[PDB]
Amino acid sequence: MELTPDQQTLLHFIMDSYNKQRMPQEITNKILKEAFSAEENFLILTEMATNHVQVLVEFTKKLPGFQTLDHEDQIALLKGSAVEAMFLRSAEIFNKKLPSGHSDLLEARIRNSGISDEYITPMFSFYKSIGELKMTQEEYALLTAIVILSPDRQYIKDREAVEKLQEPLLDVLQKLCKIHQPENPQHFACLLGRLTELRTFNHHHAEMLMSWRVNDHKFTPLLCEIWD
């Protein structure tokens, strides 16, 4: 029925940090000006990807309790959650942050950057599937924190410490569903569906990067070596 004062505090801290994330206008304006070529389209996606990485780290550092974790575990979580958090934020940018005209041109650019349909089709399918949920800013922020604070990432030394940080967030999210959608008890279940849908991108993204060869314009060592 109501969030406890402690849950309200946790939500406020997540919301404040999430609302501060921004994709700069300098990047967004390039979508309407740059040449419509595979090389220029991919350069825009490179700029977006680097902004996604910087935003992910700044959001993560501010997550309540993240600073209390073992330093190596902090890195393991960032590395492990990077793809999922990037795909989740890219869905928010595409569906909510960009005006219709910018999103139509961004899609045009994504589809003409020389990337195989094998990786482009699941991306727009995910954007549509998440778009159906009409997710609030609170749901986007909590889902992002939940993805980042996943205790089953590779090479975490103290998983129980991560579990203690992730569990209050899942509790707040389910309570928010009960408060905002009391007639729809399957709403939290629908949000969980997006978590597993996000997990499938771990392999799709890794296969995508491996499909681009060293001499190709798409090979971007700054981003690709985060996973190599």
Partner: peptide, 11 residues
């Protein structure tokens, strides 16, 4: 490792 380590540890 390099990039994620720098971004986390910087102020």
């Amino acid at each position: 490792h390099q990039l994620l380590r720098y971004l986390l540890d910087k102020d």
